[PDB]
Design a protein around this ligand. Sequence first.
Ligand code: RCO
Ligand code: RCO
Ligand code: RCO
Ligand code: RCO
Ligand code: RCO
Ligand code: RCO
Ligand code: CL
Ligand code: CL
Ligand code: ZN
Ligand code: ZN
Lengths: 21, 21, 21, 21, 21, 21, 28, 28, 28, 28, 28, 28
Amino acid sequence: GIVEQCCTSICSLYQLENYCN
Amino acid sequence: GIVEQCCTSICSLYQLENYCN
Amino acid sequence: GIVEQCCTSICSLYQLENYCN
Amino acid sequence: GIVEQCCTSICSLYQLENYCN
Amino acid sequence: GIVEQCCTSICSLYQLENYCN
Amino acid sequence: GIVEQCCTSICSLYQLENYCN
Amino acid sequence: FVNQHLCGSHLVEALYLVCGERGFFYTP
Amino acid sequence: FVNQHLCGSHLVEALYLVCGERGFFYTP
Amino acid sequence: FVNQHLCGSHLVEALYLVCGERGFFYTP
Amino acid sequence: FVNQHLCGSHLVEALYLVCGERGFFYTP
Amino acid sequence: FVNQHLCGSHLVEALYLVCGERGFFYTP
Amino acid sequence: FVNQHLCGSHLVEALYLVCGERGFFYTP
Ligand SMILES: Oc1cccc(O)c1
Ligand SMILES: Oc1cccc(O)c1
Ligand SMILES: Oc1cccc(O)c1
Ligand SMILES: Oc1cccc(O)c1
Ligand SMILES: Oc1cccc(O)c1
Ligand SMILES: Oc1cccc(O)c1
Ligand SMILES: [Cl-]
Ligand SMILES: [Cl-]
Ligand SMILES: [Zn+2]
Ligand SMILES: [Zn+2]
């Protein structure tokens, strides 16, 4: 999930966009 | 600059990016 | 939904909780 | 205090309410 | 108190400091 | 830089003022 | 408009706190 | 009203920063 | 547990900005 | 020391939301 | 005025996120 | 890497408050 991916490495804005609706 | 521009209309992330270094 | 409801009156934590999963 | 209790474990909203006036 | 004072004009950090303990 | 100085020790407001324009 | 955008951002923080381990969908 | 609620939240962050290890009471 | 909790708070704000009108889903 | 400082910032925002009109006290 | 001050604070967070390791100058 | 990133976010907000009309520069 987003917490596993993005609290252990810095997620880019592109990567964060995978959790948009 | 930024305040007159982005506090009067919603600036997108693309508009904001103009203020980056 | 949430913006029309909670940006026009202060939503309590009980009102907000309706938007939880 | 709140920092000892709530920066070492996640405090619930119920627990946080102990620091209201 | 603080809301009537500092939500009607920008309070400086010196004004805010009056509300400290 | 500010990250080296201020993410490893708590910077005071006086210290932070060194990064104002 | 800017005021609604800014309110949203506060709204998502409030939902984060209230919803806890349940999560939420945010749709504006 | 929403604007005052939102302003408060900024106000408490500013007080946190200014007051430091002194703390504060917040009463709206 | 506090670190993931505090990270989520930041995550939520970033998703708000990047997603715009689409909104997002937050699942902890 | 930075971690407790950054945690407090979050703590203050959460107390603001949960306490509403009562306000709160923050003692670091 | 208070509304512009509050908007700025959101603006700097948005710039932080968008600009990444590039940074920014903020001038109001 | 997430910790410096999350610290920067706080740093930016504090610089906003302390600098007022001068603005600030943020270099990560
Ligand atoms: O990896 C992350 C974690 C939190 C905020 C940010 O946007 C990126
Ligand atoms: O126009 C704006 C104003 C403040 C924050 C933001 O993301 C956009
Ligand atoms: O009505 C609202 C709007 C934004 C945040 C909040 O806690 C309540
Ligand atoms: O335990 C905590 C710490 C910080 C914010 C939160 O609300 C709960
Ligand atoms: O007048 C104000 C209102 C809110 C935050 C702040 O730093 C000043
Ligand atoms: O040392 C720091 C780090 C982040 C915010 C704060 O203002 C001080
Ligand atoms: Cl944090
Ligand atoms: Cl606001
Ligand atoms: Zn705001
Ligand atoms: Zn944080």
